[PDB]
Amino acid sequence: PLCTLRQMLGEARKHKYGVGAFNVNNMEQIQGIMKAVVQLKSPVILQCSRGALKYSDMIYLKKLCEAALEKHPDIPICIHLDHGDTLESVKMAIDLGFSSVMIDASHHPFDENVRITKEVVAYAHARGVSVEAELGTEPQDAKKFVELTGVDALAVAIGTSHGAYKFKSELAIDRVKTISDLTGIPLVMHGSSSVPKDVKDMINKYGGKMPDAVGVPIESIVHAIGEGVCKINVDSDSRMAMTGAIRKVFVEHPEKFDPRDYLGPGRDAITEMLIPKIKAFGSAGHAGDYKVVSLEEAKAWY
């Protein structure tokens, strides 16, 4: 069923493992992800960025998600607005039957970022919906941030960053623990694609051009994980992996044109790449640790 981030991350913090979070933008993706988490009996977070919602004129994406909830009802699935900007986006995501929200004001100075966040929190928790925010990275800063806002989780900064191009060639775990300890809440790692090496070579050898493309290498995420980090945001890898396959299939048989003939594989790679990843995140088997609290019951907490 549809699950709160307080909880799914709750059981993550407690049990020293982390849940992978995936930006979805269409069906073949929601499907790739799902096939993986199900195979490894794993909880899952499905992320829809504000670009994903528009890409899919909102409704298709809500609907695709409800298919997953209903196809795999014993698998804790959380649906999560990624990088919220305003409060009205969140009204939007909440309206969509979403059950977690991120409000990203980390580009404002502390007090502004604090205020935006608090306004989102006030709305969401009123509905039982959880809230993730971002800072920076001073441990106290965190402690203030959280105490002053009451969010269910923190995006911390240890020098990852969005996209395929993170470091010129091929991180602070030391900060993740204190932050974890002095805050008592789960932390979150945005920017945690790996550009796995198979993903990359395949895109590159099949007409594509990203001869650079570093990532966070998994060992760093494993390490981070046990030192508090509970939610791991993964986007690029997914994009990359679908694209390699499509390109592969376009070269190896240019007579095919039914998109199903490359999207179907662009899907199965997503799922393959995902599987070791998830596995090292150490969330497998955990899918059925819990009675999943609904949103109305999630209201009690607050």
Next chain:
Amino acid sequence: PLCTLRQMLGEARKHKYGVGAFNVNNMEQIQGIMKAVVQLKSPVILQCSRGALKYSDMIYLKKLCEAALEKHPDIPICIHLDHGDTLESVKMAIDLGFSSVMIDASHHPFDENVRITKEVVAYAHARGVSVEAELGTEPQDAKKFVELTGVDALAVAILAIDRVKTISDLTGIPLVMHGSSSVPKDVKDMINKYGGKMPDAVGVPIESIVHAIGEGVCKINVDSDSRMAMTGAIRKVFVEHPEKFDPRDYLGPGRDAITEMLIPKIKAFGSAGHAGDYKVVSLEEAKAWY
């Protein structure tokens, strides 16, 4: 509103036009189709092959199809099972809230086709659901088959374009053209150029289809034309932008490719602007018909 195929076509036939029937598999494909029909105030048939439903595990299609219905209220949309075969395939798609179903048993001898269809028609109609069958052809057989089965539409073997009036008139019902693809110089050439390699592929001229529609083809099954157009744009982006790697960045232009290849087709079919023509009767109310 979710619409029965009997009605949509009833109007198609009576007012002398066709409704394009469009195969769906995934999100971007439905957005393509929708934007066109909306942009042309056309009724639409969403088609769901049995392949299709398998690729989308049933439940993603049920639900994208459902998003069309709530995003575009004032559009008469009919959800049709394609190229069905078993009674159980209908029984199922009926319960994905489908509104119309084809039972294609036109491989079996004429008598067994009759039995198999009669099987579906008792099912479909009990629920209001509409039913399309297939023969192939020769006009006389077309008459009796309908007489003996009582389907709401009948696909045919036909380019041959004089049977269509005869068959239309002896049966008095909505006919249907399958495998109705044009393979326009441009979607093919867009492909071959950017690295593809299907060169010939034997098109079917839109002019022929228009002429058929006046003879009483009210439903125009299009698949491969839609498929091509997408694989058109994706190859383009792959060449012009080797670096680009986000699905949205090439999956986006495919969707448009679909939209901008349907628009003439629809126009030619003549459902442009008939979308507000009538009050849509619903699966419940429509039991009454039978």
